[PDB]
Amino acid sequence: DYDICKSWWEFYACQPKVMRLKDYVKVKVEPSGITCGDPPERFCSHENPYLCSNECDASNPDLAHPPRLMFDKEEEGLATYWQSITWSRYPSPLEANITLSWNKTVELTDDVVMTFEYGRPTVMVLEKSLDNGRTWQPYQFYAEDCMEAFGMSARRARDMSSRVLCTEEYSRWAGSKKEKHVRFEVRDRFAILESAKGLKEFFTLTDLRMRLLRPALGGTYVQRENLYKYFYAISNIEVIGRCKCNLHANLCSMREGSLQCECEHNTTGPDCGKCKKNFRTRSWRAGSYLPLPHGSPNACAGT
Amino acid sequence: QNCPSVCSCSNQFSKVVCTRRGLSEVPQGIPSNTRYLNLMENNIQMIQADTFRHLHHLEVLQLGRNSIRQIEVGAFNGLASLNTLELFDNWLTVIPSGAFEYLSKLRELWLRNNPIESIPSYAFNRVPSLMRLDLGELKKLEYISEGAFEGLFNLKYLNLGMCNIKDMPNLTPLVGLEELEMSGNHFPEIRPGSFHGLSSLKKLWVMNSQVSLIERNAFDGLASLVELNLAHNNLSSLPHDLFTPLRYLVELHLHHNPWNCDCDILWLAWWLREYISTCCGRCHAPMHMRGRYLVEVDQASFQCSAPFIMDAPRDLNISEGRMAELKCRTPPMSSVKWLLPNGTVLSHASRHPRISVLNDGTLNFSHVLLSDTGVYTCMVTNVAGNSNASAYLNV
Numbered sequence: 001d002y003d004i005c006k007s008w009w010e011f012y013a014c015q016p017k018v019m020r021l022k023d024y025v026k027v028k029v030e031p032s033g034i035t036c037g038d039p040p041e042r043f044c045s046h047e048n049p050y051l052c053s054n055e056c057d058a059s060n061p062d063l064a065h066p067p068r069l070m071f072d073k074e075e076e077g078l079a080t081y082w083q084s085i086t087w088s089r090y091p092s093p094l095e096a097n098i099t100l101s102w103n104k105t106v107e108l109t110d111d112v113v114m115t116f117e118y119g120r121p122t123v124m125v126l127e128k129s130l131d132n133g134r135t136w137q138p139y140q141f142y143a144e145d146c147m148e149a150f151g152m153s154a155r156r157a158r159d160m161s162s163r164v165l166c167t168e169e170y171s172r173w174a175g176s177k178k179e180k181h182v183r184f185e186v187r188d189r190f191a192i193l194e195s196a197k198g199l200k201e202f203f204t205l206t207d208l209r210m211r212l213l214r215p216a217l218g219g220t221y222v223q224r225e226n227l228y229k230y231f232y233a234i235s236n237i238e239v240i241g242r243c244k245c246n247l248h249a250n251l252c253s254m255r256e257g258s259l260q261c262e263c264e265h266n267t268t269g270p271d272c273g274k275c276k277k278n279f280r281t282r283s284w285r286a287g288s289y290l291p292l293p294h295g296s297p298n299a300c301a302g303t
Numbered sequence: 304q305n306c307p308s309v310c311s312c313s314n315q316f317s318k319v320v321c322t323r324r325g326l327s328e329v330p331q332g333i334p335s336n337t338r339y340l341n342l343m344e345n346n347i348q349m350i351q352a353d354t355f356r357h358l359h360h361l362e363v364l365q366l367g368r369n370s371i372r373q374i375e376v377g378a379f380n381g382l383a384s385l386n387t388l389e390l391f392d393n394w395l396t397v398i399p400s401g402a403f404e405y406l407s408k409l410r411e412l413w414l415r416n417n418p419i420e421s422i423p424s425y426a427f428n429r430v431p432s433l434m435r436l437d438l439g440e441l442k443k444l445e446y447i448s449e450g451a452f453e454g455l456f457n458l459k460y461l462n463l464g465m466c467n468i469k470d471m472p473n474l475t476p477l478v479g480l481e482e483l484e485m486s487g488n489h490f491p492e493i494r495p496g497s498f499h500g501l502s503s504l505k506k507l508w509v510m511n512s513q514v515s516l517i518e519r520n521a522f523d524g525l526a527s528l529v530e531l532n533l534a535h536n537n538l539s540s541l542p543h544d545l546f547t548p549l550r551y552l553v554e555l556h557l558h559h560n561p562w563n564c565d566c567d568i569l570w571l572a573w574w575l576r577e578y579i580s581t582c583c584g585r586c587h588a589p590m591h592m593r594g595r596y597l598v599e600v601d602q603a604s605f606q607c608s609a610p611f612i613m614d615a616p617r618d619l620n621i622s623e624g625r626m627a628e629l630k631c632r633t634p635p636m637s638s639v640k641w642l643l644p645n646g647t648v649l650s651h652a653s654r655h656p657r658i659s660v661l662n663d664g665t666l667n668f669s670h671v672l673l674s675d676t677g678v679y680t681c682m683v684t685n686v687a688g689n690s691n692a693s694a695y696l697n698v
């Protein structure tokens with residue numbers, strides 16, 4: 001829609017191509033010691049408490065489950081997952097914070113889909129940061145019982161008007177082969193050019209965080225006889241979107257360890273938010289979609 | 304003597320891990336010291352005869368998550384120490400009954416998540432040592448024989464959940480079964496005949512099975528019952544004195560059920576306060592009780608009716624060999640027992656060869672004998688009180 005920056009010089013507003021954001025992500029798995037392997041632990045099934053086939057050993061590469069496995073490219077049926085320790089510390093809660101750091105403002109275009117192995121969490125939160133982790137705001141609350149976990153009324157993103165809500169649709173126990181996804185409905189929220197300030201800003205972020213509070217319980221309350229059944233396991237976190245270049249770039253690449261806009265229209269900075277050094281006669285203006293189809297470039301100019 | 308190239312051994316030499324490889328066949332040089340062998344996440348399609356013939360110390364054989372379609376007769380030969388055989392997540396359409404030949408020390412057989420089409424008669428009979436059997440997630444299962452679980456004298460755990468079972472299989476030969484997992488099937492009604500011959504049963508799980516009604520005296524035969532899970536179903540009430548003959552029942556899962564909190568739950572609300580907080584869930588009806596936990600439901604603010612015998616049994620004059628009925632129309636949730644002239648008491652659970660108590664309370668005879676003469680009393684009980692009504696049966 002808005003791909004070409006320059007032609008024939010004549011300038012137009014431009015956006016970078018939609019990327020698979022998990023390819024350029026930095027991970028923070030808090031607290032220290034939550035990841036399985038040190039010491040080694042044997043995991044049991046909720047469907048069969050005696051079926052304890054899988055083990056996690058950090059010393060062995062075949063048995064290890066590091067955080068990086070939540071973002072790697074996967075072959076047909078060969079799923080790789082990050083796994084947490086068993087709920088051996090019960091009644092003390094089994095809590096984990098998975099932080100997705102990009103060090104760059106990224107705009108979401110599709111649903112944030114989290115793929116869990118052997119059970120989705122009973123209680124979890126999805127949060128976003130626009131200032132590299134300084135301030136945090138919630139996207140959506142996930143609970144089996146929304147009123148018991150957060151004291152919020154269970155609402156569906158499907159039944160919404162032109163808001164932070166708690167959903168129960170991604171927390172129920174349906175086995176280890178069925179219902180593996182927890183998703184943030186980006187496309188449905190957008191479905192409700194627009195010059196609204198908060199609209200584009202809502203899907204914009206530098207970081208994403210998953211506050212995993214309570215694991216899969218297998219349909220019922222916790223049975224103290226076998227705590228090796230309770231854990232977290234994430235095979236994939238699919239984040240789909242593009243770079244925020246303020247309609248001044250069509251390419252976003254890895255520069256100095258993180259993503260950066262390949263700035264056009266005589267602009268500079270990570271998000272092309274400032275005028276370049278010799279082009280500062282007019283103050284920086286962000287490019288606009290209006291008028292269609294090319295849009296206003298709003299380029300920085302020199303003497 | 305040494306570790307295979309496609310495998311990873313351990314200092315003990317006890318453990319041999321051969322996971323996440325493109326193996327279409329089992330490695331050729333597995334050491335004889337091996338106690339635990341891992342062969343998961345591979346493309347193995349067939350287990351040939353005498354494959355593990357020289358692994359006499361092997362305790363755990365992990366063949367789960369593979370493409371196993373055929374298992375030969377002598378595939379598990381020389382496995383004298385084998386305790387656990389994991390064959391889950393394979394392409395098996397038939398149970399390899401011949402393959403489980405001389406496995407005298409086998410205690411655990413996992414066959415879950417397989418395209419197994421049928422459980423034939425006397426399957427697993429060649430392994431009477433078996434204590435734990437997992438036949439869960441059998442989506443392509445079309446047939447279960449009456450004698451399928453025959454020969455399993457020492458079985459203590461059975462998992463037959465997520466098999467889309469519509470009617471209960473014959474679990475009578477499993478005389479010493481202590482744990483039964485039937486969750487994820489389809490049983491709208493739980494009958495006393497459903498769990499007949501399960502005297503030693505301690506744990507019963509019937510979750511996500513669309514259970515809408517539990518018949519009178521259904522669990523009466525389950526004397527040893529310790530744990531009962533009926534969570535995630537369509538239950539609104541439970542029959543009066545359902546848990547009374549269950550002297551050892553201490554763990555209950557009754558949550559995620561649309562409980563009707565009227566005079567009919569009062570017996571349960573008392574039972575849980577005297578024998579058991581987050582175990583039983585909340586009232587979904589009536590509107591004044593909606594949201595309250597059934598453990599917190601107080602009988603102090605309840606006005607109840609004693610059992611109403613709407614239709615008392617009528618006197619019958621019948622000839623020998625004919626079918627006779629003594630009706631007793633009572634509220635469906637009430638407790639119903641019949642006092643015969645000889646002095647014996649019958650319930651809906653009773654296995655009398657001629658006289659049967661139906662779920663509507665009516666006493667059926669099938670064929671009457673000369674000895675069936677006297678007074679038959681319909682005894683009805685509730686939380687509010689009791690009611691009795693007699694009838695004279697002539698010839």
Ligand SMILES: *[C@@H]1O[C@H](CO)[C@@H](O)[C@H](O)[C@H]1NC(C)=O
Pocket residue numbers: 030031095096097136211
């Ligand atoms: C998760 O993050 C929150 C702040 O958003 C912090 O207060 C909490 O202690 C963290 N929990 C863990 C286990 O790191």
Ligand SMILES: *[C@@H]1O[C@H](CO)[C@@H](O)[C@H](O)[C@H]1NC(C)=O
Pocket residue numbers: 618619620697
């Ligand atoms: C049953 O037989 C007795 C006589 O033995 C008679 O008095 C009574 O009315 C009969 N009842 C019915 C329903 O036939």
Ligand SMILES: [Ca+2]
Pocket residue numbers: 069070071072073074079080081234235236
């Ligand atoms: Ca992965």
